[PDB]
Design a binder for these strands. Structure first.
Ligand SMILES: [Ca+2]
Ligand SMILES: [Ca+2]
Ligand SMILES: [Mg+2]
Ligand SMILES: [Mg+2]
Ligand SMILES: [Mg+2]
Ligand SMILES: [Mg+2]
Ligand SMILES: [Mg+2]
Ligand SMILES: [Mg+2]
Ligand SMILES: [Mg+2]
Ligand SMILES: [Mg+2]
Ligand SMILES: [Mg+2]
Ligand SMILES: [Mg+2]
Ligand SMILES: [Mg+2]
Ligand SMILES: [Mg+2]
Ligand SMILES: [Mg+2]
Ligand SMILES: [Mg+2]
Ligand SMILES: [Mg+2]
Ligand SMILES: [Mg+2]
Ligand SMILES: [Mg+2]
Ligand SMILES: [Mg+2]
Ligand SMILES: [Mg+2]
Ligand SMILES: [Mg+2]
Ligand SMILES: [Mg+2]
Ligand SMILES: [Mg+2]
Ligand SMILES: [Mg+2]
Ligand SMILES: [Mg+2]
Ligand SMILES: [Mg+2]
Ligand SMILES: [Mg+2]
Ligand SMILES: [Mg+2]
Ligand SMILES: [Mg+2]
Ligand SMILES: [Mg+2]
Ligand SMILES: [Mg+2]
Ligand SMILES: [Mg+2]
Ligand SMILES: [Mg+2]
Ligand SMILES: [Mg+2]
Ligand SMILES: [Mg+2]
Ligand SMILES: [Mg+2]
Ligand SMILES: [Mg+2]
Ligand SMILES: [Mg+2]
Ligand SMILES: [Mg+2]
Ligand SMILES: [Mg+2]
Ligand SMILES: [Mg+2]
Ligand SMILES: [Mg+2]
Ligand SMILES: [Mg+2]
Ligand SMILES: [Mg+2]
Ligand SMILES: [Mg+2]
Ligand SMILES: [Mg+2]
Ligand SMILES: [Mg+2]
Ligand SMILES: [Mg+2]
Ligand SMILES: [Mg+2]
Ligand SMILES: [Mg+2]
Ligand SMILES: [Mg+2]
Ligand SMILES: [Mg+2]
Ligand SMILES: [Mg+2]
Ligand SMILES: [Mg+2]
Ligand SMILES: [Mg+2]
Ligand SMILES: [Mg+2]
Ligand SMILES: [Mg+2]
Ligand SMILES: [Mg+2]
Ligand SMILES: [Mg+2]
Ligand SMILES: [Mg+2]
Ligand SMILES: [Mg+2]
Ligand SMILES: [Mg+2]
Ligand SMILES: [Mg+2]
Ligand SMILES: [Mg+2]
Ligand SMILES: [Mg+2]
Ligand SMILES: [Mg+2]
Ligand SMILES: [Mg+2]
Ligand SMILES: [Mg+2]
Ligand SMILES: [Mg+2]
Ligand SMILES: [Mg+2]
Ligand SMILES: [Mg+2]
Ligand SMILES: [Mg+2]
Lengths: 57, 117, 115, 129
RNA sequence: GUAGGGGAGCGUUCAGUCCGCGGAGAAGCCAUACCGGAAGGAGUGGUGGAGCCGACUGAAGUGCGGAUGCCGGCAUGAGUAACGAUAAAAGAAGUGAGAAUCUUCUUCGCCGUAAGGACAAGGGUUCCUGGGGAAGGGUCGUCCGCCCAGGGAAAGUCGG
RNA sequence: GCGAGAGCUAACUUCCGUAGCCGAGAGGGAAACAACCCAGACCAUCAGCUAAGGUCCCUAAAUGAUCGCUCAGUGGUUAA
RNA sequence: AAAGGUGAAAAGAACCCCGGGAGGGGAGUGAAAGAGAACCUGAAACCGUGGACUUACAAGCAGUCAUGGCACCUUAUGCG
RNA sequence: GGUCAAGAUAGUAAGGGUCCACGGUGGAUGCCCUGGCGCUGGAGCCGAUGAAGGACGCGAUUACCUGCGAAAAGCCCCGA
């Protein structure tokens, strides 16, 4: 019992694990009603529109 | 009087480390693998120098019979026939004569063949 | 595997995923809209939607069926006397979801369920 | 243009840091903050403000407050025009490290590393090109 | 050419004497393609900001890769395992820079010879009020048994 | 390797004698390979000759010359 | 147990800017802030950002020697 | 020149490596002294008149140290 790693990992080999840790940028879009900032199939957080006003802000 | 190690050890270590250029990994950065790699590298440098003499020997020869057989005789029945042509003795890197002037290496082929008759 | 199961464990046992959907249904009808995690809103929809089709019955039987899911007599009267009659034109579209932002403690997308 | 020595130059010229601000000792792990900072890097400075309100990582908050400070210094102190601005450089480095013992099974402790970050951003005009 | 014997030497600190150098910049540090047969030594540049080289002689806590060696720092495992009982939680309202976590309301579930209450040992301000938010809290935190300040503790008859 | 005992005329066995090598011996050969074959490395050379061992291609060098032999892949695994 | 060092002098940073703060950027002081209170120097391991040359049919004690390619030119146009 | 065939050969880097440049971490190295070590030499007992060592207190504001003791960071006399 008790597996434990055998040699230390090289900086090269460990950094090439992390080859897949890249965050995906949000695909943002321009609110047609507010000024800008909006996430798709969601309300515009600033003005509250989702064709007219929804949420209070 | 105390006499601590200071400045001495870093200087030595830095000279070892600087011998490590594009050594891979911790070969270039940790002193202990740098120095250890250098022990084996000593082995290689000396052996190789002696060997490089014998390696260019080989490249020499391998061009010379390629030209020789281009003229219809092998290395063996050629460097024989120059030496049997005695005073003809130019020997050192006939390779280059075969590799650049063929008008000359053809004449040396004719000389060797005349000597073997 | 589950090739045709319908429904959600909500990382909850049998007793709780009902007492959830009952308690959430009581609040939607008591409030018109509520804001909750996007998933609970997706499961909350058809249960509340069926429950108001029960109340579209009018008679005492439908009232007592609604009562066995909704234990606050006031909300019972609201759905029974106010809302369901308002919807009696309405082939079942009684609920929509919008989904708002994404919160900050646990990073969960959240949403509105409304009438 | 060429000075007499170095004591020379320290008097005559003062080093200054156009477009640059830094948050030191931010109490977060550098490799995390690096995930989100990499999302910023080289984007037009508006997008960077735009991307950071929707990236759902906790590090977005400290990273945005640095970016605004960089935008601010480029304008107030360095008198750049802000429709040219973009993030020329951004990069996070280690800070100190708080440590605690945390008891474990059978009696042994471990040391756990609460890591900090020096998050820095450097904006410049896109009048390169 | 191993143990081993022999020879000539390099570098470090301190001491004596000499030759000197230093804010127009010293030691130390950093780069480097020069030099010597080696240990090594110089040139130039960058850094530093107050001491120091060379020669001859003397004395040593004088030369590290190892010792499951010591002290310290930092890595790998890895964004992994875990986040400490399977007694659930939901909505509205509020406060705030900021809220799944703080306050309120209304429900829900859990103990009920207890997971309610009153004492003794033991602890020592943890109590209440007003503030705070570094760290402590296994997340957050506007909250806390955490931090700051101010109050609170009453005996002829209870216990000594 | 040679000469012997012990052993099964076993053993990369053990114990004496004797020479050489390794031990402390780098270099070429034996595919790889302390001991076997050649040979004992003061330093440099993009010069030449040989040793053991080699000269079809990996892989430096005769697909050498003259007589034969084996048609088994013998070569490239023992015997009655 | 670990223990240290702004600057000659506190002149210890008024005021402005982003930020709840923390942190920073300016302006000032000072010879120096390339000394700012996580305050002399600041090596190495370790973490990063940028650049040159490279790498997605490869078998690798990580070198060594040989030759081509591409950069570069401050003991330096070379035996670099 | 355009199709068709045959053949050869470049650039992409998800991420890596060597080098360089620039920083972060961290506290070696140099310099420094407020702190030690030793030898030499002085001096060498204190207490029932309360010792050595403590406890509690004394400040406008006082947690620590220092000094002091309800006359309590001190009171009287003398000399500088
Ligand atoms: Ca993961
Ligand atoms: Ca794993
Ligand atoms: Mg087992
Ligand atoms: Mg070799
Ligand atoms: Mg020859
Ligand atoms: Mg099953
Ligand atoms: Mg779960
Ligand atoms: Mg309402
Ligand atoms: Mg029906
Ligand atoms: Mg039902
Ligand atoms: Mg325990
Ligand atoms: Mg100088
Ligand atoms: Mg040097
Ligand atoms: Mg000075
Ligand atoms: Mg010693
Ligand atoms: Mg040793
Ligand atoms: Mg060691
Ligand atoms: Mg250790
Ligand atoms: Mg557990
Ligand atoms: Mg709640
Ligand atoms: Mg508000
Ligand atoms: Mg916050
Ligand atoms: Mg909870
Ligand atoms: Mg609570
Ligand atoms: Mg209310
Ligand atoms: Mg109780
Ligand atoms: Mg008590
Ligand atoms: Mg008490
Ligand atoms: Mg309380
Ligand atoms: Mg209270
Ligand atoms: Mg309180
Ligand atoms: Mg906090
Ligand atoms: Mg504080
Ligand atoms: Mg916390
Ligand atoms: Mg009474
Ligand atoms: Mg009594
Ligand atoms: Mg026998
Ligand atoms: Mg034997
Ligand atoms: Mg031996
Ligand atoms: Mg020998
Ligand atoms: Mg040999
Ligand atoms: Mg051999
Ligand atoms: Mg061989
Ligand atoms: Mg063999
Ligand atoms: Mg053998
Ligand atoms: Mg050997
Ligand atoms: Mg020959
Ligand atoms: Mg022969
Ligand atoms: Mg050949
Ligand atoms: Mg033949
Ligand atoms: Mg000072
Ligand atoms: Mg700050
Ligand atoms: Mg400030
Ligand atoms: Mg000035
Ligand atoms: Mg600075
Ligand atoms: Mg400094
Ligand atoms: Mg600070
Ligand atoms: Mg000084
Ligand atoms: Mg410093
Ligand atoms: Mg980078
Ligand atoms: Mg790079
Ligand atoms: Mg392939
Ligand atoms: Mg390829
Ligand atoms: Mg492989
Ligand atoms: Mg990439
Ligand atoms: Mg550090
Ligand atoms: Mg010094
Ligand atoms: Mg002293
Ligand atoms: Mg006393
Ligand atoms: Mg007092
Ligand atoms: Mg006291
Ligand atoms: Mg008195
Ligand atoms: Mg007086």
């Amino acid at each position: 019992k008790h597996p434990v790693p055998k040699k230390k990992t090289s900086k090269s080999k460990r950094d090439m694990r992390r080859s897949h840790h890249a965050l995906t940028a949000p695909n943002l879009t321009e609110c047609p009603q507010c000024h800008g900032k909006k996430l798709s199939h969601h309300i515009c957080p600033n003005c509250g529109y989702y064709d007219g006003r929804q949420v209070l802000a | 009087p105390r006499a601590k190690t200071g400045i001495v050890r870093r200087r030595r270590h830095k000279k070892v480390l600087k011998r490590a250029k594009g050594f891979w990994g911790s070969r270039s950065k940790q002193y202990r693998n740098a120095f250890q790699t250098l022990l084996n590298a000593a082995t290689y440098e000396y052996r190789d120098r002696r060997n490089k003499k014998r390696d260019f020997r080989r490249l020499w020869i391998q061009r010379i019979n390629a030209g020789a057989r281009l003229h219809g005789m092998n290395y063996s029945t050629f460097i024989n026939g120059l030496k049997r042509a005695n005073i003809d003795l130019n020997r050192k890197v006939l390779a280059d004569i075969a590799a650049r002037e063929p008008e000359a290496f053809k004449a040396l082929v004719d000389a060797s063949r005349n000597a073997r008759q | 595997m589950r090739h045709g199961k319908a429904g959600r464990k909500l990382n909850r046992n049998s007793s709780a995923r009902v007492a959830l959907a009952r308690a959430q249904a009581t609040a939607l009808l008591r409030e018109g809209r509520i804001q909750t995690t996007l998933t609970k809103a997706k499961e909350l929809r058809p249960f509340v939607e069926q429950l108001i089709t029960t109340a579209k019955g009018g008679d005492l039987h439908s009232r007592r069926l609604v009562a066995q899911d909704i234990h606050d007599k006031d909300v019972v009267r609201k759905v029974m006397d106010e809302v369901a009659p308002k919807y009696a034109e309405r082939p079942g579209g009684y609920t929509r979801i919008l989904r708002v932002g994404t919160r900050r403690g646990d990073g969960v997308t959240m949403a509105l369920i409304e009438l | 243009q060429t000075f007499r020595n170095k004591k020379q130059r320290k008097q005559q010229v003062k080093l200054r840091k156009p477009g640059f601000a830094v948050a030191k000792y931010v109490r977060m792990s550098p490799r995390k903050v690096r995930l989100v900072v990499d999302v910023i890097r080289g984007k037009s400075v508006q997008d960077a403000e735009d991307l950071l309100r929707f990236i759902p990582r906790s590090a977005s908050e400290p990273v945005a407050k640095v970016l605004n400070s960089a935008k601010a210094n480029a304008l107030h102190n360095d008198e750049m025009l802000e429709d040219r601005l973009f993030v020329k450089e951004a990069y996070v480095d280690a800070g100190p490290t708080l440590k605690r013992l945390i008891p474990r099974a059978r009696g042994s402790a471990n040391i756990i590393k609460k890591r900090t970050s020096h998050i820095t951003i450097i904006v410049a005009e896109k009048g390169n090109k």
